[PDB]
Design an enzyme around this catalytic site. Sequence first.
Site, mmCIF file in Angstrom:
data_model
loop_
_atom_site.group_PDB
_atom_site.id
_atom_site.type_symbol
_atom_site.label_atom_id
_atom_site.label_comp_id
_atom_site.label_asym_id
_atom_site.label_seq_id
_atom_site.Cartn_x
_atom_site.Cartn_y
_atom_site.Cartn_z
ATOM 1 N N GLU A 54 2.334 4.745 -4.682
ATOM 2 C CA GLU A 54 1.378 4.269 -3.702
ATOM 3 C C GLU A 54 0.711 2.951 -4.052
ATOM 4 O O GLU A 54 0.256 2.268 -3.179
ATOM 5 C CB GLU A 54 0.285 5.358 -3.568
ATOM 6 C CG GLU A 54 0.961 6.595 -3.000
ATOM 7 C CD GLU A 54 1.379 6.577 -1.512
ATOM 8 O OE1 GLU A 54 1.164 5.496 -0.784
ATOM 9 O OE2 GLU A 54 1.838 7.544 -0.994
ATOM 10 N N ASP A 111 -0.622 0.261 5.621
ATOM 11 C CA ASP A 111 0.453 0.881 4.899
ATOM 12 C C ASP A 111 1.788 0.491 5.479
ATOM 13 O O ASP A 111 1.847 -0.369 6.387
ATOM 14 C CB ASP A 111 0.202 2.375 4.838
ATOM 15 C CG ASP A 111 0.394 3.174 6.106
ATOM 16 O OD1 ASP A 111 0.735 2.516 7.181
ATOM 17 O OD2 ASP A 111 0.220 4.378 6.123
#
Length: 162
Positions: A11, A20
């Site tokens: 991540e 994202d």
Amino acid sequence: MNIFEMLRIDEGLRLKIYKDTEGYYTIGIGHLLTKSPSLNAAKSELDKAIGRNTNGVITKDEAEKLFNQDVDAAVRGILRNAKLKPVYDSLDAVRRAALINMVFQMGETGVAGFTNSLRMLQQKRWDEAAVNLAKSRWYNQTPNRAKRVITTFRTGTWDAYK
Ligand SMILES: [Cl-]
Ligand SMILES: [Cl-]
């Protein structure tokens, strides 16, 4: 290696609000803020999560706290899901971390829908699950990460992360 290190690798860590891979507002260690296309909305959800007026920026400690809550939430999610729990309980420790990885990224709901793959993992048909897991939008959209998690289910080692 462990679930935390694993996810930190996949991540990243960003201290300002960012979008994202799906274009959704996120901050920290993959903490999704909102699916709404409003920056203001995202800022509102951030302040609510942190407990202060952040102005879209957080500290490293604050990101880690969110991260701990999110990991925790992911496990409980699994444990509370009728489709997931039995699989999770049948797996070894390493493979359990891979299943947590998936739920953190896609949610309990999205993972619980990988029925065929779930059944193969449960049956310990590693190579088979690995081929069925690749036949997914998840794999096509985030292939490198999907590859690492799939390798993890296939081998039961942390080789993909070393
Ligand atoms: Cl929160
Ligand atoms: Cl990827």
